[PDB]
From a paper:
Here we describe the discovery and characterisation of endo-acting glycoside hydrolases expressed by mucin-degrading members of the HGM that are able to cleave the O-glycan chains of a range of different animal and human mucins. These O-glycanases display endo-β1,4-galactosidase activity and specifically target the polyLacNAc structures that comprise the main backbone of many mucin glycan chains. All of the GH16 enzymes comprise a β-jellyroll fold, characteristic of the family, consisting of two β-sheets composed of β-strands that form the core fold, which were superimposable with other GH16 structures previously published.
The apo structures of BACCAC_02680, BACCAC_02680E143Q, BACCAC_03717 and Amuc_0724 were obtained to 2.0, 2.1, 2.1 and 2.7 Å, respectively. BF4060 and BACCAC_02680 display 79% identity and unsurprisingly the structures of these two enzymes are almost identical in the cleft region. BF4060 (and also its close homologue BACCAC_02680) has a significant preference for TriLacNAc over milk oligosaccharides and analysis of the +1 subsite shows a narrow slot where a GlcNAc would insert with the N-acetyl pointing away from the cleft and S174 from Finger 5 would pincer the N-acetyl against finger 6, thus generating specificity for GlcNAc over glucose.
Residue numbers in the entry: 34 to 274
The structure:
């Protein structure tokens, strides 16, 4: 039972303009290099892929990224098939979900299906953020510490999360990796916001380096590794029985 699918196979050179919006600048690790990105110069649909490019164009770092204007209810599973063309040191690709119409981050939560950093290059990270975990200042969230440490992100993999009232279940390649569970605390504690808001889909290949002279988690950008691309074959949202 398919609620939403984009196979990026439309007769169009950009992703569906009603569904997908270009990521915009903000002063954070994932967003800083959307600044001065001219329209779709780092985003295209080609040969059945959404291709998100990270590059340096005349000394300016530029990220490739879109987010969905639509969001999805609980009782659903998101599956995203993607690969990186190349390992890029300082590269910071991600597949993730934000609440639509939540209060300020992280009070509505955040679900990361995939993040990659050079600091652990044979891994991907799957992570959850809430106000209960992060409070006002925290950014680490709760990550799968037992994540696969012999993993090649440059091959096609299906990254997935199943979201119910009870829990988030993470998968890689159809194999359960971990669960983040509803603790059923007073809603006041903001421990499990994941079913109060529709959640969207965010697909990006960002660049790290320093943010206001502090080294970001993805670490030092090696310009010799650029350009790089994340190729998304498809995204789908399945409605559970
Ligand atoms: Ca496709």
């Amino acid at each position: 039972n398919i609620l939403f699918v984009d196979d990026f196979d439309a007769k169009c050179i950009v992703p569906d303009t009603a569904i997908w919006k270009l990521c915009t600048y903000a002063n954070n690790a994932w967003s800083q290099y959307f600044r001065g990105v001219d329209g779709y110069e780092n985003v295209k649909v080609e040969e059945g892929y959404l291709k998100l490019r990270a590059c340096k164009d005349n000394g300016t770092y530029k990220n490739g990224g879109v987010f969905s204007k639509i969001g999805f209810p609980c009782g659903t599973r998101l599956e995203v098939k993607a690969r990186l063309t190349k390992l890029v040191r300082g590269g910071f690709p991600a597949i993730w979900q934000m609440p639509i119409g939540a209060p300020e981050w992280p009070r509505g939560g955040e679900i990361d299906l995939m993040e990659w950093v050079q600091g652990s290059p044979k891994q991907i990270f799957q992570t959850v953020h809430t106000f209960y975990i992060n409070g006002e200042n925290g950014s680490a969230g709760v990550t799968n510490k037992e994540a696969d440490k012999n993993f090649d992100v440059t091959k096609d993999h299906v990254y997935a999360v199943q979201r119910t009232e009870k829990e988030l279940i993470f998968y890689v390649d159809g194999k359960e990796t971990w669960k983040y569970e509803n603790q059923h605390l007073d809603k006041e504690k903001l421990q499990y916001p994941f079913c109060e808001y529709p959640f969207n889909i965010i697909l990006n290949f960002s660049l790290g380096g320093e943010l206001n002279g502090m080294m970001t988690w993805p670490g030092e950008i090696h310009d010799e590794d650029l350009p790089g691309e994340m190729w998304v074959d498809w995204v789908r949202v399945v409605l559970l029985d």
